[PDB]
Design a protein around this ligand. Sequence first.
Ligand SMILES: C[C@H](c1ccccc1)[C@@H](CO)Nc1ncnc2[nH]ccc12
Length: 167
Amino acid sequence: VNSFSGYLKLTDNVYIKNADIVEEAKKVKPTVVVNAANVYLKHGGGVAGALNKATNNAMQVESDDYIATNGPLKVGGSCVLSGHNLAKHCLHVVGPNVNKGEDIQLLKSAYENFNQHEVLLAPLLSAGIFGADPIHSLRVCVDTVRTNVYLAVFDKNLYDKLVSSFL
Ligand SMILES: C[C@H](c1ccccc1)[C@@H](CO)Nc1ncnc2[nH]ccc12
């Protein structure tokens, strides 16, 4: 039993809800919130910009130190950093950004990072401003993640389309 509320159950391990991931994190304080990161951990817009804003830029300050020490992530890769006021940990995961010409096949590799954590709050990787089809992202999620994932879909219209089209 966990404290996630109001989710529709899609499979044994995947749950979905129309929600603002910032507000969800602030309410649940999950062990792990997933950020839709880029390789530079520059949290400008979309989920990343919103999460970082909610931390009063502390996420960005921590991320800049991480990059200065370690260099950029790989597309499809991840790192674990602090969750600040939102969660115990933030798993920064880089899905491919179609608006940059990156290979959509890397979306499965990106979701594989979730399997290192028993329970996660997360957005659909590569969706939104990353330019992929969210219906495809949900399919890859369900077919790749084996741990318990609670997906927050900000756009209510998109949420209804994902539910109604889910196979
Ligand atoms: C599927 C979602 C989306 C939103 C709008 C237009 C199309 C798609 C997603 C895409 O990355 N973005 C978010 N999801 C959850 N919580 C969020 N908080 C701030 C952003 C955000």
